[PDB]
Amino acid sequence: HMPDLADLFPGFGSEWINTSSGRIFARVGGDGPPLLLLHGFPQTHVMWHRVAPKLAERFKVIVADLPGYGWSDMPESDEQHTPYTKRAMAKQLIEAMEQLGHVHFALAGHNRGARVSYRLALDSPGRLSKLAVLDILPTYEYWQRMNRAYALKIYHWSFLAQPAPLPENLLGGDPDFYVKAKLASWTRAGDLSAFDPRAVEHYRIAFADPMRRHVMCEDYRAGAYADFEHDKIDVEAGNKIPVPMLALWGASGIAQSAATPLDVWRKWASDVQGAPIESGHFLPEEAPDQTAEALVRFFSA
Amino acid sequence: ADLFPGFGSEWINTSSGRIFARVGGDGPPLLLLHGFPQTHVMWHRVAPKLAERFKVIVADLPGYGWSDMPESDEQHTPYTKRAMAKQLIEAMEQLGHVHFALAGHNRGARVSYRLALDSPGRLSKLAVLDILPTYEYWQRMNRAYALKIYHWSFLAQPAPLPENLLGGDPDFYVKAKLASWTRAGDLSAFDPRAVEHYRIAFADPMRRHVMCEDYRAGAYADFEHDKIDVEAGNKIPVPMLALWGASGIAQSAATPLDVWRKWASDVQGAPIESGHFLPEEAPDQTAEALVRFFS
């Protein structure tokens, strides 16, 4: 519905899926077993545009905007940031998938979307055939690593979780500059060259809306509070994801800082494989051919 | 507004630039150092009572308020506490004070205990208000503390990120920091004319850049300087007073007198019912405690 934004999934349909928490926007393509792809921050569903055509050669691919992101609706939040907790987002996306007739599907997520994905696997494992998480550790593991070096290296988790309207007021002075600098700052080279400029305009246009930025802050507030508490319950109970799992991360990404990610994920999951890729955080755009191959082989095995 | 009746206004030369100070009283010399996001005026409610008994020098930190702004470098050197202490030692020498009493709050309390570790002969007595050493805050930087004092990491990010974010609405940020660290949670502990001093200083992008350089030093060289003293078991030998707010920052993740007793061989301390901004939130109790200690 935005005239000047490009169509980066030629051939894919476009659907508005109703749920009890609001509409989920998605591009839908391909044919075969169902595969849901979930972006994160500060992006929208379009960050899958370099791998989704390849995946659609082998799967029915659903590329969804997270609750409150992109063109999905933005539920009003509350004092516990409930609609933007990964538990609620996973429930909402389960409903959306049911609208399409998918009650058991494959799932790949990146960034916040990967957090939705592993929470979905901890709360509702029967919904997933297989799961892949891209350049993340569990939210509990980010916070347990917190120290001086980590606080300086990855500041925005604590910044964006500050009580409203502090991050909102600071982000709104020059939002284009912030979102473009965040995108560049976590690539391997530190610039915007890994991104299609038409995809960057999608991200910029989303980030230009104060309502969209507020959702992002609520998401990070959930990530500091309820999401962390939910994860803490699972790890202290020794609960492990039983769904077969793939952890892909960037050699220069966020997840690897002071971590061996596959060893971390083996604490959280009983059947997990994984590998690094030479990349910053944004695997599907920085290393699309290798990411698409890793996903196709994992989900088709 | 002039909030220091009976005080002069002095520009004091140093090799790094001028230090501005309000000066009043007579008797033994006592230097007062403010911190962030404030200026010398945050002492306006206690400096009169101290000037009954002391010559009181209320100085703007290097780069803050009306003091000159030395040019920084890639290691943030002029805004390290060791460098700020050296510059203020020079300023005090311009007035003929080579052995003086010293009280600091926030960043200025960090200048102050660094001064005591580097040049203890300069100090008769030291008071620090609502801080622990920079090293101790970073050692405590877990999830809970990263959320509570997020600005230690945010303002320390590489330029221009905090500078750019702060330039959108500087008045909001400075007022938010002031209110959020008080007991009341609003601006009602502050004199409106003092707030206006802080807002005017914070409105200048050059002043905000200094403040970020100060927090960058606090994340790097200040931390390393403190770590050397810890590793060496160095304790401040200057008689010392640690005051902190019962709902302030220093008590948040630590037992303040227990911490300072590891850094100082002769330290007394007390909590005061106050948030972080002791001299404005709790002026009578803060002034009483300082008067009795320095006398």
Concatenating the DSSP letter of every residue in B199-238 gives: HHHHHSHHHHHHHHHHHHHHHTHHHHHHHHHHHHT--B-S
Distance from CA of B23 to the nearest CA of A (A): 37
**Do B88 and B62 touch, CB atoms closer than 8 A?**
yes
Q: For residue A280, give the 3-state DSSP assignment.
A: coil
Q: β-strand B19-25 against B55-59: which pairing, if any? A: antiparallel
Q: Name the strand (E) or helix (H) holding B264.
A: none
Looking at residue A126, the DSSP 8-state letter turns out to be G
Task: Say if A16 is an interface residue toward chain B (CB within 8 Å).
Answer: no
Report how far residue A171's alpha carbon sits from residue A162's, in angstroms, rounded to the nearest whole number: 12
Report how far residue A95's alpha carbon sits from residue A88's, in angstroms, rounded to the nearest whole number: 11
Task: Say if A175 is an interface residue toward chain B (CB within 8 Å).
Answer: no
Report how far residue B167's alpha carbon sits from residue B11's, in angstroms, rounded to the nearest whole number: 29
Phi–psi pair at A241, nearest 5 degrees: -60, 125
CATH number of B1-295: 3.40.50.1820
Hey, which bits of B53-99 come out as E strands?
A: 55-59
For chain B, the domains span: 1-295
How far is CA B256 from each of CA B76, B131, B263, B284, rounded to the nearest angstrom? 28, 8, 11, 21
Q: What b-and-e string marks burial along A96-126, b requiring 16 or more CB atoms within 10 Å of the CB?
A: bbeebebeebbbbbbbbbbbbbbbbbbeeee
How far is CA B103 from each of CA A287, B43, B198, B286, rounded to the nearest angstrom? 56, 10, 20, 11
Q: At what angle do helices A112-123 and A86-99 cross, to 10 degrees?
A: 80
Chain A residue whose CA is closest to B170: A170
The architecture (CATH level 2) of A1-301 comes to 3-Layer(aba) Sandwich (3.40)
Task: Say if B168 is an interface residue toward chain A (CB within 8 Å).
Answer: yes
Resolution value (Å, 1 decimal): 1.5
Nearest of A78, A34, A79, A74 to residue A56 by alpha carbon: A34
Which residues does B18 contact at the CB level (< 8 Å), separation at least 6? B11, B12, B67, B68
Contact yes or no for B143 and A177 at CB 8 A: no
Hey, which bits of chain A come out as E strands?
A: 13-17, 24-30, 34-38, 60-64, 105-110, 128-134, 245-250, 272-277
How far is CA B240 from each of CA A206, B101, B167, rounded to the nearest angstrom? 54, 10, 39
Report how far residue B197's alpha carbon sits from residue B216's, in angstroms, rounded to the nearest whole number: 24
- The residues pairing with A17 across neighbouring beta strands, listed in sequence order, are A24
Of A155, A158, A170, nearest to B168 by CB-CB distance is: A170
Looking at residue A241, the DSSP 8-state letter turns out to be B
Q: Name the strand (E) or helix (H) holding A215.
A: helix A210-224
Q: Tell which A residues from 268 to 287 touch B, by Cβ distance under 8 Å.
A: none
Q: The dihedral of CA A229, A235, A241, A242: what is its sign?
A: negative
How far is CA A165 from each of CA A18, B199, B244, rounded to the nearest angstrom? 30, 19, 28
Chain A residue whose CA is closest to B153: A152
CB neighbours of residue B189 within 10 Å = 20
Q: For residue A22, give the 3-state DSSP assignment.
A: coil
Residue A8: HSE in the Cβ half-sphere, 13 Å Cα cutoff: 23
Q: Tell which B residues from 135 to 154 touch A, by Cβ distance under 8 Å.
A: 138-139, 141-143, 146-147, 150, 152-154
Q: Could you tell me the two tokens for A294? A: 């890793």
Q: Is A161 exposed, middle or buried (0-12, 13-18, 19+ CB in 10 A)?
A: buried
Q: Is B132 left (phi over 0), alpha (psi -120 to 50) or beta?
A: beta
Residue B258: HSE in the Cβ half-sphere, 13 Å Cα cutoff: 4
Contact yes or no for A155 and B152 at CB 8 A: no
Instruction: Write the single-letter amino acid at B237.
Output: P
Task: Say if B166 is an interface residue toward chain A (CB within 8 Å).
Answer: yes
**First-last CA distance in chain A:** 38
Report how far residue A236's alpha carbon sits from residue B279's, in angstroms, rounded to the nearest whole number: 44
- The residues pairing with B30 across neighbouring beta strands, listed in sequence order, are B56, B101
DSSP B8-23: EEEEE--TT--EEEEE
**Residue contacts between A and B (CB atoms, under 8 Å):** 67
Nearest of B259, B280, B281 to residue B47 by alpha carbon: B280
Distance from CA of B9 to the nearest CA of A (A): 36
- Distance from CA of residue B280 to its chain's centroid? 14
Experimental method: X-ray
Instruction: Write the single-letter amino acid at A129.
Output: S
**Do A120 and A94 touch, CB atoms closer than 8 A?**
yes
Distance from CA of B142 to the nearest CA of A (A): 5
Nearest of A183, A204, A201 to residue A192 by alpha carbon: A183
Task: Say if B167 is an interface residue toward chain A (CB within 8 Å).
Answer: yes
Q: β-strand A60-64 against B19-25: which pairing, if any? A: unpaired
Contact yes or no for B147 and A161 at CB 8 A: yes
Nearest of B117, B113, B97 to residue B105 by alpha carbon: B113
Using only C-alpha atoms, chain B has a radius of gyration, in whole angstroms, of: 17
Distance from CA of A151 to the nearest CA of B (A): 6
How far is CA A108 from each of CA A285, B44, B71, rounded to the nearest angstrom? 15, 60, 49
Distance from CA of B135 to the nearest CA of A (A): 10
Report how far residue A220's alpha carbon sits from residue A157's, in angstroms, rounded to the nearest whole number: 6
Contact yes or no for B165 and A170 at CB 8 A: yes
Looking at residue B112, the DSSP 8-state letter turns out to be H
Q: Name the strand (E) or helix (H) holding B124.
A: strand B123-129
**Do B60 and B134 touch, CB atoms closer than 8 A?**
no
Report how far residue A8's alpha carbon sits from residue A202's, in angstroms, rounded to the nearest whole number: 10
Chain B residue whose CA is closest to A162: B147
Which residues does A123 contact at the CB level (< 8 Å), separation at least 6? A87, A90, A91
CB neighbours of residue B91 within 10 Å = 26
Report how far residue A167's alpha carbon sits from residue B165's, in angstroms, rounded to the nearest whole number: 9
How far is CA A8 from each of CA A199, A288, B132, B216, rounded to the nearest angstrom? 8, 14, 53, 41
Task: Say if B159 is an interface residue toward chain A (CB within 8 Å).
Answer: no
CB neighbours of residue B172 within 10 Å = 15
Which residues does A214 contact at the CB level (< 8 Å), separation at least 6? A77, A164, A168
Report how far residue A113's alpha carbon sits from residue B215's, in angstroms, rounded to the nearest whole number: 33
Which residues does B274 contact at the CB level (< 8 Å), separation at least 6? B183, B245, B246, B247, B248, B281, B282, B285, B286
CB neighbours of residue B100 within 10 Å = 19
Contact yes or no for B157 and A155 at CB 8 A: yes
Of A148, A170, A178, nearest to B141 by CB-CB distance is: A148
Contact yes or no for B169 and A166 at CB 8 A: no
Instruction: Write the single-letter amino acid at A185.
Output: S
Instruction: Write the single-letter amino acid at B202.
Output: F
